[PDB]
Amino acid sequence: SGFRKMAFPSGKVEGCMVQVTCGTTTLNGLWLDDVVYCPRHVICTSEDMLNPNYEDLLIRKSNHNFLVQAGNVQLRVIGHSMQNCVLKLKVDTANPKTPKYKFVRIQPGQTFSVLACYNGSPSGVYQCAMRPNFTIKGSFLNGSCGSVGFNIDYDCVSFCYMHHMELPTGVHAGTDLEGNFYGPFVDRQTAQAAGTDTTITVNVLAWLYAAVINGDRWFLNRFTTTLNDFNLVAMKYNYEPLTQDHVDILGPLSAQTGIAVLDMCASLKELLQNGMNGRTILGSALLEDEFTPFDVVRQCSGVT
Amino acid sequence: SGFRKMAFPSGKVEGCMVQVTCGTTTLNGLWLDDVVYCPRHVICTSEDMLNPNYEDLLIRKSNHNFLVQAGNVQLRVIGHSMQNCVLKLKVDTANPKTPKYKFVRIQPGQTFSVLACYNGSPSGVYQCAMRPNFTIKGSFLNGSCGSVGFNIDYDCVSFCYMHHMELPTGVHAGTDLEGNFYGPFVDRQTAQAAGTDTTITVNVLAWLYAAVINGDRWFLNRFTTTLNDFNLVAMKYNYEPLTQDHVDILGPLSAQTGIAVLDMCASLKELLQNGMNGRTILGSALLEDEFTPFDVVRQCSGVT
Numbered sequence: 001s002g003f004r005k006m007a008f009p010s011g012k013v014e015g016c017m018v019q020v021t022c023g024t025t026t027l028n029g030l031w032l033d034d035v036v037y038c039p040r041h042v043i044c045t046s047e048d049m050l051n052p053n054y055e056d057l058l059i060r061k062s063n064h065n066f067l068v069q070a071g072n073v074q075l076r077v078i079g080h081s082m083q084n085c086v087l088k089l090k091v092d093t094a095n096p097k098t099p100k101y102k103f104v105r106i107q108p109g110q111t112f113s114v115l116a117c118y119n120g121s122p123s124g125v126y127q128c129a130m131r132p133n134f135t136i137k138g139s140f141l142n143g144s145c146g147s148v149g150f151n152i153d154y155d156c157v158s159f160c161y162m163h164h165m166e167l168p169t170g171v172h173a174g175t176d177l178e179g180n181f182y183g184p185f186v187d188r189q190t191a192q193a194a195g196t197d198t199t200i201t202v203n204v205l206a207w208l209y210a211a212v213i214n215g216d217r218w219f220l221n222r223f224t225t226t227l228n229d230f231n232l233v234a235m236k237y238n239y240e241p242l243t244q245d246h247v248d249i250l251g252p253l254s255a256q257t258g259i260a261v262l263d264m265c266a267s268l269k270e271l272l273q274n275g276m277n278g279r280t281i282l283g284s285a286l287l288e289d290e291f292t293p294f295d296v297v298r299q300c301s302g303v304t
Numbered sequence: 305s306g307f308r309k310m311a312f313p314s315g316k317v318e319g320c321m322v323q324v325t326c327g328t329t330t331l332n333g334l335w336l337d338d339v340v341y342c343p344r345h346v347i348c349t350s351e352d353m354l355n356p357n358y359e360d361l362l363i364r365k366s367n368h369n370f371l372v373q374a375g376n377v378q379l380r381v382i383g384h385s386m387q388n389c390v391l392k393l394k395v396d397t398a399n400p401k402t403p404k405y406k407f408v409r410i411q412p413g414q415t416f417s418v419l420a421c422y423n424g425s426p427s428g429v430y431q432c433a434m435r436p437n438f439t440i441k442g443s444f445l446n447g448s449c450g451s452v453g454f455n456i457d458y459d460c461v462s463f464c465y466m467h468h469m470e471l472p473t474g475v476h477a478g479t480d481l482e483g484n485f486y487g488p489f490v491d492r493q494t495a496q497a498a499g500t501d502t503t504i505t506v507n508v509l510a511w512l513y514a515a516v517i518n519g520d521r522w523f524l525n526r527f528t529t530t531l532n533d534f535n536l537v538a539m540k541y542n543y544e545p546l547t548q549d550h551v552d553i554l555g556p557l558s559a560q561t562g563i564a565v566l567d568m569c570a571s572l573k574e575l576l577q578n579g580m581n582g583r584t585i586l587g588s589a590l591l592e593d594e595f596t597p598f599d600v601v602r603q604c605s606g607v608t
């Protein structure tokens with residue numbers, strides 16, 4: 001028993017972390033096979049950050065201007081290209097530590113582990129979710145650019161995120177491993193609106209099941225609801241509208257606890273309308289939405 | 305900016321995780337050099353768990369009865385011994401992935417990362433603290449025994465914890481890497497009292513500094529206090545008595561923010577006496593005590 005904000009073991013990803021220096025700028029890169037992926041803003045300076053013409057800036061850069069360093073060794077850049085907001089530097093050596101990998105673009109509400117890096121060296125690992133407004137509430141400092149978000153399926157690493165920037169609101173924006181930004185964000189130092197951040201209702205419900213599984217049952221009530229009645233309440237409280245897919249995905253948790261999804265929705269409805277009254281659930285005084293039903297199942301079953 | 309419950313990168317520890325099977329029992333072991341460390345209760349069955357005479361049980365076991373498996377390969381046990389509540393199985397091969405390491409016994413209030421394992425395979429990593437009552441509020445299922453807690457100092461892994469059991473209260477108890485239990489716990493399936501769990505005051509203050517550093521300043525007030533006045537309030541609210549050592553350890557955080565430690569103590573005093581009033585600090589509705597001042601400095605400076 002016990003429920004924690006667990007992250008995937010980072011070893012497979014640590015073996016992919018390299019330093020990428022272009023001119024006076026240094027950030028993290030991901031070395032998989034003979035390619036190093038990093039944010040394209042490595043070619044920028046702090047002057048041309050207001051309005052960068054990346055095609056123009058990149059034209060003034062050659063293979064030898066990209067200094068890729070893995071631990072202590074220097075990699076030889078034999079090719080370079082821009083793919084959306086990422087640079088792909090082809091190196092003469094394939095990473096001997098390259099795990100089995102996939103580049104996948106995750107959906108909002110989905111969770112992933114982040115390995116925060118500085119100068120190509122890992123420093124921390126934490127779990128987080130792709131917020132419904134496509135931002136991540138991470139922990140990143142100047143130098144963390146190129147740090148990746150990933151998931152692990154036995155031995156296969158699914159890279160889903162690459163960190164690029166911190167918005168003036170303190171939250172973080174970045175791309176999938178093909179250079180496509182999650183959200184409406186552009187890699188420009190300009191005023192960007194993150195948008196309304198709503199609560200991942202299917203995740204709050206999954207975490208409510210995790211609480212029942214681990215003993216915290218106080219919030220459980222004698223009531224029930226319907227998808228439309230529950231949704232009227234979710235809209236007022238800025239909660240993601242719950243669909244029949246969400247109900248189905250909660251099926252295995254509903255089976256483990258014997259609590260119907262709509263009964264759990266009524267318990268949640270009462271927690272939104274009445275608050276916690278000073279009580280906690282899984283050691284938290286607020287409703288947690290950064291655990292997917294897959295995370296709750298995996299953590300409460302012990303998948304390695 | 306941004307503040308998260310970060311764990312150390314687990315790669316160095318993943319390379320030490322092995323499976324240890326003794327009879328019908330299977331748990332995790334830590335392979336460093338030619339020794340595998342694991343909880344001694346691997347030699348027990350579910351019958352002799354009420355009152356095990358480990359010296360007697362161990363006498364009936366030989367080197368060949370311990371099946372140590374690293375990934376896919378089977379290690380050859382050429383020696384075995386009991387050191388307090390741990391078994392040290394000497395194997396014929398030194399772990400080629402053994403990092404630079406130390407076995408240190410941490411103090412309550414100190415934090416460490418846990419790599420949760422099942423059948424010698426890592427499944428998750430999370431950060432946690434040694435509670436003042438010597439228990440850990442972890443996330444462990446049947447099979448996680450032998451999972452370790454550690455800290456990393458550049459390239460040196462300080463092993464501080466080995467998981468042994470879950471108490472009937474749902475919290476976890478385990479040993480340092482010399483087999484010595486943290487707390488009054490014995491490796492017996494009997495009613496054990498965890499004790500009163502208090503709040504790590506120096507950690508709540510460090511996290512309050514982290515909040516000011518990251519922008520959340522609402523809790524900051526126009527008042528000040530003294531160590532003795534603050535402590536009267538800490539005692540009523542079951543908070544660890546704050547000493548002059550704690551004040552000194554908060555020195556660098558107090559310097560970064562320009563907020564005197566006793567001024568922050570007055571802000572904390574008001575948060576205890578008046579509650580949060582529905583507000584949050586660093587995205588949390590309760591006072592967080594699982595970040596030491598070293599963690600706040602490391603996370604807000606970017607140490608790799």
Ligand SMILES: O=C1[C@H](c2ccc(Cl)cc2)CCCN1c1cncc2ccccc12
Nearest residue numbers: 041140141142143164165166187188189305
């Ligand atoms: O957001 C940025 C900056 C930026 C600006 C424009 C464009 Cl196009 C991309 C990136 C500079 C590089 C670092 N960076 C940061 C990324 N994460 C955490 C940060 C914490 C404090 C300070 C800067 C941080």
Ligand SMILES: O=C1[C@H](c2ccc(Cl)cc2)CCCN1c1cncc2ccccc12
Nearest residue numbers: 001345444445446447468469470491492493
């Ligand atoms: O506490 C124990 C048991 C035990 C009993 C007596 C003695 Cl001497 C040691 C250990 C059996 C082995 C597994 N174990 C567990 C450890 N962590 C999480 C557990 C979650 C659910 C069930 C058991 C868990």
